[PDB]
Amino acid sequence: MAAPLPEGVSAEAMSSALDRFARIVGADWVFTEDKITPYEDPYTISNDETEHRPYAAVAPASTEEVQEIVRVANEFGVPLWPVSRGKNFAYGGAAPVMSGTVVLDMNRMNRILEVNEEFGYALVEPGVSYFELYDYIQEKGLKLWIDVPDLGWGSVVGNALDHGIGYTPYGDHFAMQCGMEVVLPNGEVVRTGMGAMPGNNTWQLFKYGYGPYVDGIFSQSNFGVVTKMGIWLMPEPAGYRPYLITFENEDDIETVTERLRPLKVAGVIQNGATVRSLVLDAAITRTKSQYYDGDGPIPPSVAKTMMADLDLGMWNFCGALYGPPPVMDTLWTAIRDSFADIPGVKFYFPEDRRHKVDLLLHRAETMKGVPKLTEFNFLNWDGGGGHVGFSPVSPITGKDAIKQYNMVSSRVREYGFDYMGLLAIGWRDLHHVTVIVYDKTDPDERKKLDELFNILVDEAAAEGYGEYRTHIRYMDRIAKTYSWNDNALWKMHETIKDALDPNGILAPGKSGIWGKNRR
Amino acid sequence: MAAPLPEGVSAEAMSSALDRFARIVGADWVFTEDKITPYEDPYTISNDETEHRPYAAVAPASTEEVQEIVRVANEFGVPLWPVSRGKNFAYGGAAPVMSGTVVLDMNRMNRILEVNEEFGYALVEPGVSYFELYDYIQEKGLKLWIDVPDLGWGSVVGNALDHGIGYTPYGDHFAMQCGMEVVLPNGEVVRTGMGAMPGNNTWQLFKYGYGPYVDGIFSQSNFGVVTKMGIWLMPEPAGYRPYLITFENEDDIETVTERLRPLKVAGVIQNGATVRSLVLDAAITRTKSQYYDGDGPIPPSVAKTMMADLDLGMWNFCGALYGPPPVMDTLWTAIRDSFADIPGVKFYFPEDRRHKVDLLLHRAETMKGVPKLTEFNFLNWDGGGGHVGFSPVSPITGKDAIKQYNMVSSRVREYGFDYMGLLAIGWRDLHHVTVIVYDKTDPDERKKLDELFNILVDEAAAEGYGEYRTHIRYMDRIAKTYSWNDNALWKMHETIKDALDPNGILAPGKSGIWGKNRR
Ligand SMILES: Cc1cc2nc3c(=O)[nH]c(=O)nc-3n(C[C@H](O)[C@H](O)[C@H](O)COP(=O)(O)OP(=O)(O)OC[C@H]3O[C@@H](n4cnc5c(N)ncnc54)[C@H](O)[C@@H]3O)c2cc1C
Ligand SMILES: Cc1cc2nc3c(=O)[nH]c(=O)nc-3n(C[C@H](O)[C@H](O)[C@H](O)COP(=O)(O)OP(=O)(O)OC[C@H]3O[C@@H](n4cnc5c(N)ncnc54)[C@H](O)[C@@H]3O)c2cc1C
């Protein structure tokens, strides 16, 4: 079934828009039905073929082409779905919320404008991948690390703008942003911060500039198209020691989280360290069928067998030390002493791992910013599937961690899926990302996944828990959970949306923001 | 003379608005006529008595009262100048850019809503001083440090919103902000981040929440009235050692800045440490009259006498080590060895200071977040005066540092003032704050200061340098320096301003933003 036109847009208006796009970028870089396949969500959820369908895609190579595309979209009322690389797998890929939207694919805008060793930053266009930035740094011999969101195939820009997370001390990607160029929804270009000062030498050095600090309004947003972004990069440290602490019991996560809090708030845990559930870690190197012939989630005997076979716990705390040996030794004494009295606790450095293909050796690369595709391995757990991320935020407190674990694991397993949970340790919070692996080709599994996801969102909200990020299908539902004072914040967002994008031609539905024409 | 009415506002409209303000807050809390003098800039620059004059002030006690004040302001077109404590001395005090504006003074909203030791944060109303938060923590024996912008009598909220800076690892005040409540210019109230989730326990734990990240648009801004704000606080560390490294030659700042860069980018220098010029440091414990009889700036022979008398350099690098003794020792080796080969360098810990009253013993308190009022001491240098901050931003590069020093020192001294320079070390930048001390009672000194300030701004902009913060008198001038792409950024600011504040009743002129009715 082909994509429907967006509501209120005639075939004539769409067809005039697409010819104009082709004049701007060249005929090779407008993709219509029967080249639109790569822009579909790779991990389908809806059984309604009219939903989340991109009409077409346009692939510009310059900010100027982005501006002309945006001006043409305003002229014809043709909505755009901007993506940097479009690898938002488990959140919709490159697909739009609203069917009929045209993807604005910035993959070919892939210039690394600068990597500065002395100040530790990069200035990049959206199409720059983690692989590409990492390779540029290695080729030029620069003593910098990047921060990778597990997968290296995505965008330094796009991932940051979606509030993405990685696992070095620079793991809060958007927090490490400094300076950006934005094509506003009227086609005008602005630079934030010190970029607004002609002849500046500080765009990537001082976030604020002068006046209102607006960079964050273009993150998880449809207020503009970001065409250049700065990011701070960590200097190569004087030492690096990855570690893995494992826990025997699902209920250990309560005491473990209580012990993590003071270590993280004091900066003793230097990186975006993680606590990962057994199945998420096992699925990197094994499949369910190697331990169990059953059709549903694993029983306790299978969990215990996997733990003994792979030297994993029910909970696996993976982190790294950074800096000179006397600093790393001091921090390690504090971390080790915080967990050493928990019955069933085990400690590993990489040299202690018996298996040649092992989760710690993979995470040792991730926590020094090596781009990889290893994380897709968990999709093989049940014979090959897609995934969706249920990502509530939790305080770093055991009560909240064990509550969310119980609420999510119970429901996922009830719906036939194994629980695969990541607790990513932020400055003062935990990002609880549950990856639900399902057969995206089976309409019955898709139906179950959709019902489960709605339950997870509703039960979490009923407990005062909100998600930090979501799939295109649930962006309205999540926005409706942030309802304080009769949806006051989204009323403000819509006010700003109508001022910057009166014609509503930028990603209608992103973060539940639609604009007056479609509200 | 008395304040003029704001342009376009009738005596009747002003009179009606002020009566309605008294109905909201109570008759005791609207200030007119003789009661307005505390809201005047204490450090007058203009020789025109019609400029920067508040008409009146209103002092609410609740968010509800702020909302009703804003609604009434819209009804009568009476503009407001919101302040938290109004102690913005060196940038206008509590005075508005536009004469006739009514100050919205939130001093009486001074609840500490929560100080959380486990998570290291406070949730505060605008009227909470650094003194009050420090005294609360000390009374309750909480193991938390605050971060003070030298002076303790200003607002944890107000200072952060103006992008203020301090001297501990938590020195970037706005960066430590997490969650805020805002009264929008229509009088509606919003909470940012996880505050938008009813029943949340994460407002002060996770900055972003979901969707566009807007907190920053209410900093250096007239887009809203902040009524509550969270801030992260540093857990008390396991050790603390403050230090002073002095340099004999004004030209040492070039190589000293080159050495600071890699130490700061790698986080070896843990705090917002500072490099302060001779006279700025001398002026904390001495006056010019104790070394010199002339009424203009000091000659070289006098600087050499001051240096030997006080154990200060032409440049004084003041920082602190934080953490366990093995961490502090490892970082100290790296910092010390960076400077040890510079001819004339001297290294001091507090026990090496021979003066009982001494610059290092003062800053030892500041760099562990002890609130004080001793920074006003530099106002005595030339007999007593006010000050204005010329605050350009510089890369952490010797070339830029020595250029700004030469450009500013030369002009300030040419206009009869001594150079007092602060280079506050941020993550990747230097905030170059030059405090110009002048007789604010002398119209001739005020004329020279105003002429000097305009020259400093223009010359810095000619060299691609912009200010991070400025006085009410120069907010338009500084906005016009950020002119990239025909003032694209300010055109966007005005677009958002007209959307959130169509009647332009919030702080017209703040950061050079006026709104359609007054631009
Ligand atoms: C197995 C697996 C593991 C994963 N692990 C992680 C992980 O560890 N960390 C993590 O953060 N994510 C993770 N993800 C989610 C996701 O795959 C990555 O975050 C990915 O990097 C995002 O795609 P991207 O970088 O190409 O961003 P894009 O898809 O280019 O951008 C994401 C969204 O941001 C907006 N956007 C992007 N660029 C712009 C722009 N220039 N202007 C305006 N709006 C823009 C759009 O709404 C877009 O849809 C994982 C997914 C899977 C399936
Ligand atoms: C000798 C001396 C030393 C100084 N040292 C420092 C220093 O080390 N660090 C430093 O940062 N500054 C310094 N200053 C500048 C200044 O005095 C302080 O920053 C002071 O704390 C700011 O006043 P405040 O905290 O009362 O903020 P306020 O005056 O309350 O706020 C400042 C401005 O922010 C806006 N604002 C405030 N609250 C709100 C709100 N609720 N909603 C909307 N807008 C709001 C308004 O525009 C207001 O005018 C110094 C000044 C002097 C004279």
PDB file of C-alpha atoms and ligand atoms in Angstrom, chain A residues 43 81-91 93 106 126 130 148-151 153-159 161-167 173 218 221 224-227 375-376 378-379 387 422 435 468-469 510, ligand 1:
ATOM      1  CA  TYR A  43      10.747  -2.156  13.055  1.00  0.00           C
ATOM      2  CA  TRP A  81      10.608  15.194   8.536  1.00  0.00           C
ATOM      3  CA  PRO A  82      14.236  16.269   9.095  1.00  0.00           C
ATOM      4  CA  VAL A  83      16.785  13.533   9.974  1.00  0.00           C
ATOM      5  CA  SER A  84      20.582  13.739  10.252  1.00  0.00           C
ATOM      6  CA  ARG A  85      21.291  10.106   9.333  1.00  0.00           C
ATOM      7  CA  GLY A  86      17.841   8.621  10.133  1.00  0.00           C
ATOM      8  CA  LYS A  87      19.179   5.644  12.135  1.00  0.00           C
ATOM      9  CA  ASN A  88      16.667   6.220  15.011  1.00  0.00           C
ATOM     10  CA  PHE A  89      16.044   2.439  15.134  1.00  0.00           C
ATOM     11  CA  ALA A  90      13.674   1.474  18.063  1.00  0.00           C
ATOM     12  CA  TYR A  91      12.135   4.996  17.816  1.00  0.00           C
ATOM     13  CA  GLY A  93      14.012   4.926  12.016  1.00  0.00           C
ATOM     14  CA  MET A 106      20.808  15.230   5.562  1.00  0.00           C
ATOM     15  CA  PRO A 126      24.420  16.116  10.416  1.00  0.00           C
ATOM     16  CA  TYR A 130      30.337   8.090  14.797  1.00  0.00           C
ATOM     17  CA  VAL A 148      29.253   6.449  21.132  1.00  0.00           C
ATOM     18  CA  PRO A 149      25.578   5.528  21.820  1.00  0.00           C
ATOM     19  CA  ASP A 150      26.519   1.787  21.582  1.00  0.00           C
ATOM     20  CA  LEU A 151      25.862   1.815  17.767  1.00  0.00           C
ATOM     21  CA  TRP A 153      26.084   3.982  12.461  1.00  0.00           C
ATOM     22  CA  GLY A 154      24.061   7.024  13.704  1.00  0.00           C
ATOM     23  CA  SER A 155      24.682  10.787  13.664  1.00  0.00           C
ATOM     24  CA  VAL A 156      26.866  12.794  16.154  1.00  0.00           C
ATOM     25  CA  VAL A 157      24.213  15.541  15.589  1.00  0.00           C
ATOM     26  CA  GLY A 158      20.930  13.533  15.320  1.00  0.00           C
ATOM     27  CA  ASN A 159      21.572  11.392  18.401  1.00  0.00           C
ATOM     28  CA  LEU A 161      19.358  16.295  19.348  1.00  0.00           C
ATOM     29  CA  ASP A 162      17.204  13.266  20.455  1.00  0.00           C
ATOM     30  CA  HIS A 163      18.941  13.529  23.928  1.00  0.00           C
ATOM     31  CA  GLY A 164      20.952  10.359  23.227  1.00  0.00           C
ATOM     32  CA  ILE A 165      23.231   8.617  25.713  1.00  0.00           C
ATOM     33  CA  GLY A 166      26.664   6.989  25.671  1.00  0.00           C
ATOM     34  CA  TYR A 167      29.087   5.459  28.121  1.00  0.00           C
ATOM     35  CA  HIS A 173      25.482  13.883  24.272  1.00  0.00           C
ATOM     36  CA  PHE A 218      16.033  22.606  18.744  1.00  0.00           C
ATOM     37  CA  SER A 221      11.955  19.468  18.513  1.00  0.00           C
ATOM     38  CA  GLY A 224      14.187  24.234  13.252  1.00  0.00           C
ATOM     39  CA  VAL A 225      16.553  22.156  11.096  1.00  0.00           C
ATOM     40  CA  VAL A 226      20.033  21.918  12.599  1.00  0.00           C
ATOM     41  CA  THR A 227      22.694  22.052   9.823  1.00  0.00           C
ATOM     42  CA  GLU A 375      24.584  -4.005  20.145  1.00  0.00           C
ATOM     43  CA  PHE A 376      22.306  -5.193  17.267  1.00  0.00           C
ATOM     44  CA  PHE A 378      20.407  -8.711  21.039  1.00  0.00           C
ATOM     45  CA  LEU A 379      17.904  -8.716  18.095  1.00  0.00           C
ATOM     46  CA  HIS A 387      12.964  -3.661  18.921  1.00  0.00           C
ATOM     47  CA  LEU A 422      19.451  -1.036  30.699  1.00  0.00           C
ATOM     48  CA  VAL A 435      14.393  -2.979  24.705  1.00  0.00           C
ATOM     49  CA  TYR A 468      12.948  10.671  28.143  1.00  0.00           C
ATOM     50  CA  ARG A 469      12.470   9.525  24.533  1.00  0.00           C
ATOM     51  CA  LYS A 510       7.457  15.405  16.725  1.00  0.00           C
TER      52      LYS A 510
HETATM   53  C1  LIG C   1      20.082  -2.209  19.349  1.00  0.00           C
HETATM   54  C2  LIG C   1      19.947  -0.727  19.578  1.00  0.00           C
HETATM   55  C3  LIG C   1      20.768  -0.080  20.469  1.00  0.00           C
HETATM   56  C4  LIG C   1      20.668   1.303  20.694  1.00  0.00           C
HETATM   57  N1  LIG C   1      21.527   1.872  21.596  1.00  0.00           N
HETATM   58  C5  LIG C   1      21.420   3.156  21.803  1.00  0.00           C
HETATM   59  C6  LIG C   1      22.280   3.768  22.733  1.00  0.00           C
HETATM   60  O1  LIG C   1      23.116   3.140  23.362  1.00  0.00           O
HETATM   61  N2  LIG C   1      22.160   5.117  22.927  1.00  0.00           N
HETATM   62  C7  LIG C   1      21.251   5.861  22.258  1.00  0.00           C
HETATM   63  O2  LIG C   1      21.222   7.060  22.503  1.00  0.00           O
HETATM   64  N3  LIG C   1      20.405   5.314  21.361  1.00  0.00           N
HETATM   65  C8  LIG C   1      20.481   4.022  21.134  1.00  0.00           C
HETATM   66  N4  LIG C   1      19.641   3.426  20.212  1.00  0.00           N
HETATM   67  C9  LIG C   1      18.640   4.258  19.512  1.00  0.00           C
HETATM   68  C10 LIG C   1      19.110   4.828  18.156  1.00  0.00           C
HETATM   69  O3  LIG C   1      19.354   3.768  17.241  1.00  0.00           O
HETATM   70  C11 LIG C   1      20.364   5.713  18.213  1.00  0.00           C
HETATM   71  O4  LIG C   1      20.209   6.717  19.198  1.00  0.00           O
HETATM   72  C12 LIG C   1      20.721   6.384  16.880  1.00  0.00           C
HETATM   73  O5  LIG C   1      22.048   6.903  16.952  1.00  0.00           O
HETATM   74  C13 LIG C   1      19.779   7.505  16.501  1.00  0.00           C
HETATM   75  O6  LIG C   1      19.781   7.716  15.061  1.00  0.00           O
HETATM   76  P1  LIG C   1      20.638   8.908  14.417  1.00  0.00           P
HETATM   77  O7  LIG C   1      21.859   9.122  15.237  1.00  0.00           O
HETATM   78  O8  LIG C   1      20.791   8.643  12.962  1.00  0.00           O
HETATM   79  O9  LIG C   1      19.662  10.163  14.577  1.00  0.00           O
HETATM   80  P2  LIG C   1      18.542  10.725  13.584  1.00  0.00           P
HETATM   81  O10 LIG C   1      17.618   9.606  13.271  1.00  0.00           O
HETATM   82  O11 LIG C   1      19.212  11.419  12.456  1.00  0.00           O
HETATM   83  O12 LIG C   1      17.803  11.810  14.498  1.00  0.00           O
HETATM   84  C14 LIG C   1      16.832  11.412  15.492  1.00  0.00           C
HETATM   85  C15 LIG C   1      15.671  12.377  15.474  1.00  0.00           C
HETATM   86  O13 LIG C   1      16.119  13.685  15.912  1.00  0.00           O
HETATM   87  C16 LIG C   1      15.577  14.696  15.090  1.00  0.00           C
HETATM   88  N5  LIG C   1      16.663  15.278  14.309  1.00  0.00           N
HETATM   89  C17 LIG C   1      17.806  14.655  13.897  1.00  0.00           C
HETATM   90  N6  LIG C   1      18.603  15.446  13.223  1.00  0.00           N
HETATM   91  C18 LIG C   1      17.946  16.666  13.199  1.00  0.00           C
HETATM   92  C19 LIG C   1      18.279  17.911  12.637  1.00  0.00           C
HETATM   93  N7  LIG C   1      19.408  18.139  11.973  1.00  0.00           N
HETATM   94  N8  LIG C   1      17.396  18.924  12.803  1.00  0.00           N
HETATM   95  C20 LIG C   1      16.267  18.679  13.477  1.00  0.00           C
HETATM   96  N9  LIG C   1      15.850  17.553  14.048  1.00  0.00           N
HETATM   97  C21 LIG C   1      16.747  16.572  13.869  1.00  0.00           C
HETATM   98  C22 LIG C   1      14.474  14.039  14.267  1.00  0.00           C
HETATM   99  O14 LIG C   1      13.247  14.077  14.959  1.00  0.00           O
HETATM  100  C23 LIG C   1      15.021  12.620  14.106  1.00  0.00           C
HETATM  101  O15 LIG C   1      13.992  11.677  13.842  1.00  0.00           O
HETATM  102  C24 LIG C   1      19.704   2.049  19.986  1.00  0.00           C
HETATM  103  C25 LIG C   1      18.869   1.373  19.078  1.00  0.00           C
HETATM  104  C26 LIG C   1      18.980   0.008  18.869  1.00  0.00           C
HETATM  105  C27 LIG C   1      18.048  -0.705  17.922  1.00  0.00           C
END
